[PDB]
């Protein structure tokens, strides 16, 4: 009876709670957001709100390296993802 779609209010409270509590207290952050748990807050942070996550359009050399590594390590997106510098969900989505 937790989770669902992420709204913008929850993301801004998540950012402010990161600014107060840091990236190692996700159960203090998840007491600030009802209908979201600590694992969900952490997953949401590392997958869509961390300001290293390149949300721009894929370049040509990135998708060349993507096709090379995805032919090179089959279905290993958590291993490919730090090499090509995108989130593994973004990486898998763009590969498909």
């Amino acid at each position: 009876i937790k989770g669902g779609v992420w709204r913008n209010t929850e993301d801004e409270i998540l950012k402010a709670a990161v600014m107060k509590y840091g990236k190692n207290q996700w159960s203090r952050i998840a007491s600030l957001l009802h209908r979201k748990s600590a694992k969900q807050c952490k997953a949401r942070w590392y997958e869509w709100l961390d300001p290293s996550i390149k949300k721009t359009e894929w370049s040509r050399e990135e998708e060349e390296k993507l096709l090379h590594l995805a032919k090179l390590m089959p279905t290993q997106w958590r291993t490919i993802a730090p090499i090509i510098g995108r989130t593994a969900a973004q990486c898998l989505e763009h590969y498909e």
Partner: protein, 130 residues
């Protein structure tokens, strides 16, 4: 017509600031030769003392002397009280602190780590991208 420029460098020492302050105060003072030559003619040979002369426990300053000292020292205290000029508080900057000490800690953090965390600021403003 004369011209002189005297800026300051960084801090470096509590003694260099003392010496700068001393050179300011010691250029500002002007002696009166009347009292000087009066005391010179009165004291004679002992007016040019060594370390071990005798006159250490004798001098009694008249009221005008101690008044001049206290006025000078009050000017010096005021000039020292103006040491940190308060930077004006604009409220158009997006505030980043929930407290009054928090603001000054964030200012110190922007002093030290502002030169490095400049890409991540650009990411945070452009939408956590690149």
């Amino acid at each position: 017509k004369k011209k002189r420029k005297n800026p300051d460098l960084g801090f470096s020492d509590y003694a260099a600031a003392q010496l700068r302050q001393y050179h300011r105060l010691t250029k500002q003072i002007k002696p009166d030769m009347e009292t000087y030559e009066r005391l010179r003619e009165k004291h004679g040979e002992e007016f040019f003392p060594t370390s071990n002369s005798l006159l250490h426990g004798t001098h009694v300053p008249s009221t005008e002397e101690i008044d001049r000292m206290v006025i000078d020292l009050e000017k010096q205290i005021e000039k020292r009280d103006k040491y940190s000029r308060r930077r004006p508080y604009n409220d158009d900057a997006d505030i980043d602190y929930i407290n009054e000490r928090n603001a000054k800690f964030n200012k110190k953090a922007e002093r030290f780590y502002g030169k490095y965390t400049a890409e991540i600021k650009q990411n945070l403003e452009r939408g956590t991208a690149v």
